Design an enzyme around this catalytic site. Structure first.
Site, PDB file in Angstrom:
ATOM      1  N   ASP A 135       0.838  -1.190   0.000  1.00 59.78           N
ATOM      2  CA  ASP A 135       0.000   0.000   0.000  1.00 59.78           C
ATOM      3  C   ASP A 135       0.880   1.249   0.000  1.00 59.78           C
ATOM      4  O   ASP A 135       2.108   1.149  -0.102  1.00 59.78           O
ATOM      5  CB  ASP A 135      -1.040  -0.042   1.140  1.00 59.78           C
ATOM      6  CG  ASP A 135      -0.417  -0.116   2.527  1.00 59.78           C
ATOM      7  OD1 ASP A 135       0.689   0.426   2.735  1.00 59.78           O
ATOM      8  OD2 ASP A 135      -1.060  -0.688   3.443  1.00 59.78           O
ATOM      9  N   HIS A 150      -9.464   3.917  14.261  1.00 62.36           N
ATOM     10  CA  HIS A 150      -9.375   4.389  12.879  1.00 62.36           C
ATOM     11  C   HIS A 150     -10.242   3.549  11.940  1.00 62.36           C
ATOM     12  O   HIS A 150     -10.891   4.088  11.032  1.00 62.36           O
ATOM     13  CB  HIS A 150      -7.924   4.359  12.381  1.00 62.36           C
ATOM     14  CG  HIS A 150      -7.031   5.406  12.976  1.00 62.36           C
ATOM     15  ND1 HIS A 150      -7.382   6.738  13.075  1.00 62.36           N
ATOM     16  CD2 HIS A 150      -5.765   5.318  13.448  1.00 62.36           C
ATOM     17  CE1 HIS A 150      -6.378   7.416  13.606  1.00 62.36           C
ATOM     18  NE2 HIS A 150      -5.383   6.579  13.838  1.00 62.36           N
ATOM     19  N   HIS A 160      -7.616  11.616  15.356  1.00 62.95           N
ATOM     20  CA  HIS A 160      -6.774  11.725  16.538  1.00 62.95           C
ATOM     21  C   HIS A 160      -7.349  12.677  17.577  1.00 62.95           C
ATOM     22  O   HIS A 160      -8.097  13.612  17.263  1.00 62.95           O
ATOM     23  CB  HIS A 160      -5.352  12.128  16.165  1.00 62.95           C
ATOM     24  CG  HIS A 160      -4.561  10.991  15.606  1.00 62.95           C
ATOM     25  ND1 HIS A 160      -3.562  11.149  14.671  1.00 62.95           N
ATOM     26  CD2 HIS A 160      -4.649   9.663  15.845  1.00 62.95           C
ATOM     27  CE1 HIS A 160      -3.063   9.964  14.362  1.00 62.95           C
ATOM     28  NE2 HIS A 160      -3.704   9.045  15.063  1.00 62.95           N
ATOM     29  N   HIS A 208      -6.296   1.444  19.354  1.00 69.14           N
ATOM     30  CA  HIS A 208      -6.091   2.668  18.586  1.00 69.14           C
ATOM     31  C   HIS A 208      -6.413   2.446  17.114  1.00 69.14           C
ATOM     32  O   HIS A 208      -7.149   3.230  16.500  1.00 69.14           O
ATOM     33  CB  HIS A 208      -4.645   3.144  18.767  1.00 69.14           C
ATOM     34  CG  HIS A 208      -4.320   4.412  18.031  1.00 69.14           C
ATOM     35  ND1 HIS A 208      -4.262   5.641  18.654  1.00 69.14           N
ATOM     36  CD2 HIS A 208      -4.043   4.641  16.722  1.00 69.14           C
ATOM     37  CE1 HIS A 208      -3.959   6.569  17.763  1.00 69.14           C
ATOM     38  NE2 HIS A 208      -3.817   5.990  16.584  1.00 69.14           N
ATOM     39  N   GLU A 209      -5.865   1.378  16.527  1.00 65.44           N
ATOM     40  CA  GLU A 209      -6.073   1.146  15.101  1.00 65.44           C
ATOM     41  C   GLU A 209      -7.535   0.847  14.783  1.00 65.44           C
ATOM     42  O   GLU A 209      -8.063   1.337  13.776  1.00 65.44           O
ATOM     43  CB  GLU A 209      -5.152   0.038  14.585  1.00 65.44           C
ATOM     44  CG  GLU A 209      -3.665   0.373  14.650  1.00 65.44           C
ATOM     45  CD  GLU A 209      -3.290   1.678  13.945  1.00 65.44           C
ATOM     46  OE1 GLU A 209      -2.237   2.250  14.303  1.00 65.44           O
ATOM     47  OE2 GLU A 209      -4.027   2.147  13.048  1.00 65.44           O
TER      48      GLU A 209
HETATM   49  N1  LIG Z   1       6.938   8.315  18.445  1.00 67.17           N
HETATM   50  C1  LIG Z   1       6.654   7.484  19.430  1.00 67.17           C
HETATM   51  O1  LIG Z   1       6.493   7.858  20.592  1.00 67.17           O
HETATM   52  C2  LIG Z   1       6.577   6.029  19.060  1.00 67.17           C
HETATM   53  C3  LIG Z   1       8.008   5.590  18.807  1.00 67.17           C
HETATM   54  C4  LIG Z   1       8.356   4.149  19.130  1.00 67.17           C
HETATM   55  C5  LIG Z   1       9.851   3.987  19.132  1.00 67.17           C
HETATM   56  O2  LIG Z   1      10.504   4.547  18.259  1.00 67.17           O
HETATM   57  O3  LIG Z   1      10.393   3.265  20.066  1.00 67.17           O
HETATM   58  N2  LIG Z   1       5.774   5.759  17.878  1.00 67.17           N
HETATM   59  C6  LIG Z   1       4.514   6.157  17.753  1.00 67.17           C
HETATM   60  O4  LIG Z   1       3.843   6.592  18.696  1.00 67.17           O
HETATM   61  C7  LIG Z   1       3.922   6.026  16.378  1.00 67.17           C
HETATM   62  C8  LIG Z   1       4.489   7.053  15.382  1.00 67.17           C
HETATM   63  C9  LIG Z   1       4.135   8.498  15.726  1.00 67.17           C
HETATM   64  C10 LIG Z   1       4.642   9.477  14.680  1.00 67.17           C
HETATM   65  O5  LIG Z   1       5.864   9.395  14.237  1.00 67.17           O
HETATM   66  O6  LIG Z   1       3.856  10.364  14.282  1.00 67.17           O
HETATM   67  N3  LIG Z   1       2.468   6.034  16.437  1.00 67.17           N
HETATM   68  C11 LIG Z   1       1.801   5.078  15.813  1.00 67.17           C
HETATM   69  O7  LIG Z   1       2.363   4.112  15.319  1.00 67.17           O
HETATM   70  C12 LIG Z   1       0.317   5.223  15.702  1.00 67.17           C
HETATM   71  C13 LIG Z   1      -0.043   5.329  14.217  1.00 67.17           C
HETATM   72  C14 LIG Z   1      -1.490   5.702  13.990  1.00 67.17           C
HETATM   73  O8  LIG Z   1      -1.852   6.885  14.180  1.00 67.17           O
HETATM   74  O9  LIG Z   1      -2.295   4.815  13.633  1.00 67.17           O
HETATM   75  C15 LIG Z   1      -0.326   3.976  16.312  1.00 67.17           C
HETATM   76  C16 LIG Z   1      -0.628   3.933  17.776  1.00 67.17           C
HETATM   77  C17 LIG Z   1      -0.984   4.793  18.745  1.00 67.17           C
HETATM   78  C18 LIG Z   1      -1.143   4.036  19.911  1.00 67.17           C
HETATM   79  C19 LIG Z   1      -1.547   4.472  21.279  1.00 67.17           C
HETATM   80  C20 LIG Z   1      -1.686   3.528  22.294  1.00 67.17           C
HETATM   81  C21 LIG Z   1      -2.087   3.919  23.566  1.00 67.17           C
HETATM   82  C22 LIG Z   1      -2.371   5.254  23.837  1.00 67.17           C
HETATM   83  C23 LIG Z   1      -2.798   5.695  25.184  1.00 67.17           C
HETATM   84  C24 LIG Z   1      -2.238   6.829  25.753  1.00 67.17           C
HETATM   85  C25 LIG Z   1      -2.635   7.256  27.013  1.00 67.17           C
HETATM   86  C26 LIG Z   1      -3.603   6.557  27.700  1.00 67.17           C
HETATM   87  C27 LIG Z   1      -4.164   5.436  27.129  1.00 67.17           C
HETATM   88 CL1  LIG Z   1      -5.379   4.563  27.997  1.00 67.17          CL
HETATM   89  C28 LIG Z   1      -3.777   4.994  25.872  1.00 67.17           C
HETATM   90  C29 LIG Z   1      -2.246   6.185  22.816  1.00 67.17           C
HETATM   91  C30 LIG Z   1      -1.851   5.800  21.544  1.00 67.17           C
HETATM   92  N4  LIG Z   1      -0.919   2.764  19.680  1.00 67.17           N
HETATM   93  O10 LIG Z   1      -0.589   2.673  18.306  1.00 67.17           O
HETATM   94 ZN   LIG Z   2      -0.402  -1.063   5.270  1.00 64.37          ZN
HETATM   95 ZN   LIG Z   3      -3.653   7.049  14.800  1.00 65.01          ZN
END
Ligand SMILES: NC(=O)[C@H](CCC(=O)O)NC(=O)[C@H](CCC(=O)O)NC(=O)[C@@H](CC(=O)O)Cc1cc(-c2ccc(-c3cccc(Cl)c3)cc2)no1
Ligand SMILES: [Zn+2]
Ligand SMILES: [Zn+2]
Ligand SMILES: [Ca+2]
Ligand SMILES: [Ca+2]
Ligand SMILES: [Ca+2]
Length: 159
Positions: A66, A118, A124, A114-115
């Site tokens: 994709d 979406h 967001h 989270h996914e």
């Molecule tokens: N940048 C970061 O802090 C990490 C880096 C990981 C690393 O490099 O080790 N990566 C991400 O968060 C990535 C990339 C962000 C960017 O570069 O813009 N984020 C994702 O992969 C999200 C992609 C998307 O938007 O679909 C996926 C995502 C978000 C989450 C998430 C999980 C739990 C929470 C949360 C936070 C607070 C409370 C609660 Cl209950 C839950 C929030 C978000 N899980 O997967």
């Molecule tokens: Zn994909």
């Molecule tokens: Zn997201």
């Protein structure tokens, strides 16, 4: 104001399984992640193994067919398409992460919540305690709760 499914019965299918976890634990994490959203909407989710599922769950690496290539370990953890036919709704997880049931690596359940958000049409959140916040954080999955902003967002799309 993203797209929505125009039905309340939605199927999912797990296309393939990460070797990081056993099959039973992948199934459980995904089922519980769907249950988070069904708990606050009229939506119901059933897992199927053949046929035409709405939401395909995929683990893949790098450039994977994709326009949203993954980046190796770190950075992007997963991505998902909004509601629609075909690739619409599908949720893709970066196999270069280390998926876990716990606080180490990247927790599959939290990422899937989270996914799936979406996949149901959410964007967001600016609330740092919302699961739809853009960046991952680990929280005790035993006491995990959607934030009030998440519930507001999904109840505005369904019901
Ligand atoms: N940048 C970061 O802090 C990490 C880096 C990981 C690393 O490099 O080790 N990566 C991400 O968060 C990535 C990339 C962000 C960017 O570069 O813009 N984020 C994702 O992969 C999200 C992609 C998307 O938007 O679909 C996926 C995502 C978000 C989450 C998430 C999980 C739990 C929470 C949360 C936070 C607070 C409370 C609660 Cl209950 C839950 C929030 C978000 N899980 O997967
Ligand atoms: Zn994909
Ligand atoms: Zn997201
Ligand atoms: Ca990555
Ligand atoms: Ca689909
Ligand atoms: Ca992996």
């Amino acid at each position: 104001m993203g797209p929505v499914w125009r039905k309340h019965y939605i199927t999912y299918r797990i296309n393939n399984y990460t070797p990081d976890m056993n099959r039973e634990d992948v199934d459980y994490a995904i089922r519980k992640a769907f249950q988070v959203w069904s708990n606050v909407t009229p939506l119901k989710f059933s897992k199927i193994n053949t046929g035409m599922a709405d939401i395909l769950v995929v683990f893949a690496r790098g450039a994977h067919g994709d326009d949203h290539a993954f980046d190796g370990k770190g950075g992007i953890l997963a991505h998902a398409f909004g509601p629609g036919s075909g690739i619409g709704g599908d949720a893709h997880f970066d196999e270069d992460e280390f998926w876990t049931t716990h606080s180490g690596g990247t927790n599959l359940f939290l990422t899937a919540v989270h996914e799936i958000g979406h996949s149901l049409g959410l964007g967001h959140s600016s609330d740092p305690k919302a699961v739809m916040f853009p960046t991952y954080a680990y929280v005790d999955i035993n006491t995990f709760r959607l934030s009030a902003d998440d519930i507001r967002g999904i109840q505005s799309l369904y019901g």
